[PDB]
Design a protein around this ligand. Sequence first.
Ligand code: HEM
Ligand SMILES: NCCc1c[nH]cn1
Length: 184
Amino acid sequence: ACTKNAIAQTGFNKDKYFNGDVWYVTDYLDLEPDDVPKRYCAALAAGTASGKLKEALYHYDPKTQDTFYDVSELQVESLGKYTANFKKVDKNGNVKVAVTAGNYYTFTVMYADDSSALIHTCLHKGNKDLGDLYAVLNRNKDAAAGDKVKSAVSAATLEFSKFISTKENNCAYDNDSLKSLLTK
Ligand code: HEM
Ligand SMILES: NCCc1c[nH]cn1
């Protein structure tokens, strides 16, 4: 299970974060891991679409080739803190698994600027036992974590050297699908 109440960034700028553009996960910290996809690719788009706050997700295991997209309408808990009931979709937004209660992640933006961010997420999916996951994001998929975001990792009482990089995995992303999924 999840154990963290992550604190949102002071003065979080929601319209800048949710500007409809793409964010790439460059490094992550799973608190509840194992033999799991040690190598992983993930990215999201976040924006307001016809007045609704939205996130589109992409996951790719470059070793198994397991691929999936999700789209959610976010609900606000407080500034920088959201609950997302997700639906699994194909890249075009056609529903594969409909929204259901019990399938949701929370999402806290702990730090963000115009190029980088640190988020916490707690995933819930049916009867499964899942733990916290932190992720370092960047607008550039190949960007090394800079001092702003690494300092924020430290400020969250975490150690960046423990985070796992995705940069070795040779991830390629469909940015266009992620942006268009925001409307679906
Ligand atoms: C912004 C970051 C992330 C968020 C919001 C996110 C959220 C989610 C959601 C919503 C699901 C379930 C999707 C579905 O069943 O339709 C999922 C599944 C999963 N995610 Fe992520 N994820 C993120 C990052 C990552 C990272 C970096 C990895 C690698 C450690 C990871 C590995 C997986 C795994 C292996 C699954 C399959 C879970 C299962 O069904 O047991 N995710 N994630
Ligand atoms: N224990 C990490 C579960 C996960 C996958 N995606 C988001 N969270």
